[PDB]
Amino acid sequence: SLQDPFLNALRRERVPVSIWLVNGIKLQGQIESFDQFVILLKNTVSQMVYKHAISTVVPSRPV
Template structure:
């Protein structure tokens, strides 16, 4: 049961990416697995959902429904290989 391995905390790439687009308020296009295209900015996210805002509308999108996220500008992600 309990292995005595040191626990390293690694940020999941999805968390780093979503936090970068949220922090910078980058407009993006989100494609769902059923082909629907959503556009807006990420205002919040957790392990299961993303809040996407466009104008006065906010949509709660489940991560398992997302196929692709396409930001409208380059994203600088903290912890990327370019910074190392």
């Protein structure tokens, strides 16, 4: 798995990401947590995003 170190680094370092969804909508926030199926995106509000609904995870700055 490359997924787990990619997300885990962005979570340890508290990097602001943009999570684009498969319908077009972008979301922005810090990655509070994740597991095999979902990512907890902690923003103004902490929301759970299903990976199946995600197209790409983009760090706002080069880490």
